[PDB]
Symmetry: D2
Subunit: 344 residues, 4 copies
């Protein structure tokens, strides 16, 4: 075909989703974890449960061993604080970059630009399966249009990144997801695009997508009424009760339930991980004082605090954004459970 | 799984549309020559102006071909000064919801006859290119480009998707030049980052001409540039052009810009495109070399109309954004040509 | 794995169907002929089904000139004959050389199968669009999706009548299907095949999208035997009566199509005229079980070897009668059908 | 179009079965060794006998694994005289209609759960190979081979498909040796032709491991041999073996045969397999080096049953010898091998 493929270097074979679903099917326990966590979050979003959704874990997964260890520690906190918090592990292996960089465990699991994406999908699905099988629900970022078919059945909640909240193809994707979805405000703090995204994702759509068989097809979606905003900061943080009030009034003006998830990290801590503890103190004060609009928080936490460059790597340390460590993580979760107790 | 997926329906693979509607020799020629002419402008070796002009959206092949004949005659008449490419946009990004264009819903009745839309779209693109008129499109969808991209001489990544990794990846592998619009709030940096990302090779998941998903490796696309489309305020004036030139150079990129006369640069007021035109013409004729292109929303008949009314549609008139009509279009093209001649001295 | 040397891309059927869709005339031709052949197989029509044309197609130009000539005799003899043109692309062999128009359209072992499917479908479309129905041979489980909508009648080869995979295929074809007796002249494998093919089946098959899938068939009640000879010819009254008995003792209608060529002519193309004379005698004498015949026929008689330019309109596979004998043969059959009533 | 196609349902691609059920280290070695061993026998560089033995058809994985454990013992005990390979036949060719085997209908109830069939068949095949017992099957379907062939040590083309181009093409690209059965009427020629065709390279349409149709090119299979299985009369006697050794040379192939003790050789009477075994054992004992392998229909319990519930260990297709006769037969074979030595 003339005029075609000048800038396409190579085309390589990709396992279809059914190969990964057949090799790694959901166990009864894993399926039960997903189904109950989705239902619990739905109940929170409808305002029929005063517990707080807590999405917490590494910025990115690069080592499944450290991830399973983290998951085990977090599951104890989950069972302990279950009357106040719906704790969901952050399991992100699809990173959005400002220009170029490691896009995650799926795109390059060996972290060396070998781009063994078939291996990455196997590793990623096995890890998600093991975590859900242990009883801990998982949350992911939906950046790619094709990877969700391999993993979405093991996801109890999802986030559309700030860089794609305005994008029609991602609003389309959210409209057909089986889990609830958070939309981050814009990388410059724009709330309008996330409200538009929630309204768009709530409506039915018809668009082209790839099936479990690895074939493109026409898909029709129902619309996703389990979508909400995530406050992530802009040029300035936006977690204070002042910003919440403005965000609540905008949601209502737009006909949307006045509820928000607050990300303690990213632009809300100015990309310095220790200040997540500060945001926590502030957010706990709002909740404890009766703020019922705060239905969720997101925290970047790992076994070992800080970060490291892909430049021997340290264990349980982030290779992307800096995270809090486990002792801080333990205290942060109890603070929120206590703040939820007070609000009640 | 599939709780919110209502129905899944069969989709013709790209090779089916390619086999039914192959490029003629002259259509392939139109595309190859326009892509090369744009590359030459982008490298600084040609002092002509790229003009991407035509309907906000295609909804009627009949009016689109009548428009193309008129524009082709001016493309020929003004070719020493302008490289004229027709906007042939089959996909529209909506602020929230609405008609997504001819491919998604060709019958404009929410029947979503996408296989029909792909047939109509490629046939029209083939006819326009075969007449001698190159075509431009917005690359919004991740799967439709394999059906159409061999007939596109230039593509745009919209304001709402310039920051999106999968769109930057797509551009890194397209065979045509690509413009990146600034952010809907006016932010320049997202488009500069996009140019740099698109110029690098990538590895990502995509769909082949056989309709199967695959791993793809791109070489990177060096024929990318920024499109100024305004923000909270318009950004076409010399003060803004200067800041963007400096921002590109500081990022190691040639100081070159395409200026969209419409969208936020006209405050969505279609006749103000003529006012942007006057200002941009004065910049070009006064000596501004960085303005390598413009974009204009233009139809046979000015204004727009609504599909929601159920009234029979008027001929040659946009059902999306309001456009200038043919008479203004002719005048505007002659203004731009006169300005490019004056810039040469 | 280790005996698979290379895998190349193949256009899916839907690509050929989009490029070459059936015209209204073509679909009408296929519809009318399939119904007419059904009306004959059900005993409700007394005309003779004549499948006639080249042993194999290797040149679309000669094939369309042949179709023009045959169409004229189709129209003139329509009161007696249901004339269907033989549009076969290959000579099922063991290896020899040429592998057929689809496999090797350029006749040079380049195996440009994508080119061959385009050429083969376009020709079928043109012939049907002109009003002339087409008959084909099903030797492949994947080719049919690209061409079967343009076929009014199909044959299963003698080397595959016993194959479960080919009987499965027949059970889902939209056209009548003829099963040849065995290369040795046995009728049991073809009665067994008519029975298997009349039953529903479930099997794996490639769809129009080029993807394998599970398919269910209704079973094909429009199947019949083709008498093609064995060690000796088997077209005579003695053999027809003997096959009728086998068909009756099987629950199947006592009806045959007789191939004048292949083993029945002792592989001597001119002897097809001798078979014609005999069969015309059976038919004029009142034999109603002969519902159809098959004839290898081209513009120019005889055959030629593929090496260098080729003679126009002459087979590069088995030898055929030429047009002069073909016109006389068809008129003999028409006359015989008349005398039968 | 598709007016005889009732329904089209989704089918897992082979990569999906290959990913769920990958070959273990052990299973991979079982196949690698057994294929090498058969090649060495087929090249004349090993005096042992290839014994393809097991049920006519697998229909119960549980009974099949018990059988496999019993046969594996005899495989180790008799390893210096015999190279023993399980029959693990998942596909059965019918004379007309009937149960086509475990893959086509694993629940034996015309529900055609072919995705379940393929998971069942592959898991059983994988377990058997992992224990150390090589496996054999008939390659009948054109699409199922991609799901199983990496676990096959030896394959068979049935008598009703020996003449089929598509099956000879399939044979030319299989990574395992292939035996070709003589025609059902006993015709030897079709089988020699098939062996010649399969040793040659071919280009044809097939389905890949991703479930997509494609153009494939094969190298040719040199490890092919004839399988004598009777026709009108049995053809296992040294008279018939003589004629076949002669007919192979006349065609330029090695003079070596496999003898199937069942089907038309035992007149479809399973006890007669012991009589064929007596006769064939005397040919071996008497020095016949051409008999390189034998095929035997064996199950845990002799006889067969119709398809109410099913008796344990009894074939639901052709009648088989029971396990007591199987141990006896196998030791008869190993004894004659030590005699010929
Ligand atoms: Mn982060
Ligand atoms: Mn517009
Ligand atoms: Mn012939």
């Amino acid at each position: 075909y003339q005029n075609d493929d000048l800038r396409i270097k190579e085309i390589k074979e990709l396992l279809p989703p059914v190969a990964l679903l057949e090799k790694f099917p959901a166990t009864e326990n894993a399926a039960n974890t997903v189904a109950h966590a989705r239902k619990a979050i739905h109940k929170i979003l409808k305002g029929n449960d005063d517990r707080l959704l807590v999405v917490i874990g590494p910025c990115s997964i690069h080592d499944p061993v450290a991830a399973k260890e983290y998951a085990t520690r977090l599951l104890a906190l989950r069972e302990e604080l279950k009357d106040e918090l719906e704790i969901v592990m952050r399991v992100y292996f699809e990173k959005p970059r400002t220009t170029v960089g490691w896009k995650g465990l799926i795109n390059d699991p060996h972290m060396d630009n070998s781009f063994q994406i078939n291996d990455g999908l196997r590793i990623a699905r096995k890890l998600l399966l093991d975590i859900n099988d242990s009883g801990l629900p998982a949350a992911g970022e939906f950046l790619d249009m094709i990877t969700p078919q391999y993993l979405a059945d093991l996801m109890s909640w999802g986030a559309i990144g700030a860089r794609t909240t305005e994008s029609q193809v991602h609003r389309e994707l959210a409209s057909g997801l089986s889990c609830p979805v958070g939309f981050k405000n814009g990388t410059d703090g724009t709330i309008k695009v996330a409200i538009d995204a929630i309204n768009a994702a709530g409506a039915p759509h018809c668009f082209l997508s790839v099936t479990k068989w690895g074939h493109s097809a026409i898909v029709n979606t129902s619309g996703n009424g389990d979508c909400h905003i995530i406050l992530r900061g802009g040029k300035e943080p936006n977690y204070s009760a002042k910003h919440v009030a403005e965000v609540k009034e905008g949601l209502n003006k737009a006909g949307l339930p006045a509820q928000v998830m607050i990300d303690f990290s990213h632009a809300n801590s100015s990309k310095q991980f220790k200040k997540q503890m500060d945001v926590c103190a502030d957010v706990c004060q709002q909740i404890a004082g009766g703020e019922k609009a705060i239905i969720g928080v997101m925290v970047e936490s790992h076994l070992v605090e800080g970060n490291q460059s892909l430049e021997p790597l340290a264990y349980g340390k982030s290779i992307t954004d800096a995270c809090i460590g486990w002792e801080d993580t333990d205290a942060l979760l109890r603070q929120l459970a206590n703040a939820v107790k007070a609000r009640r």
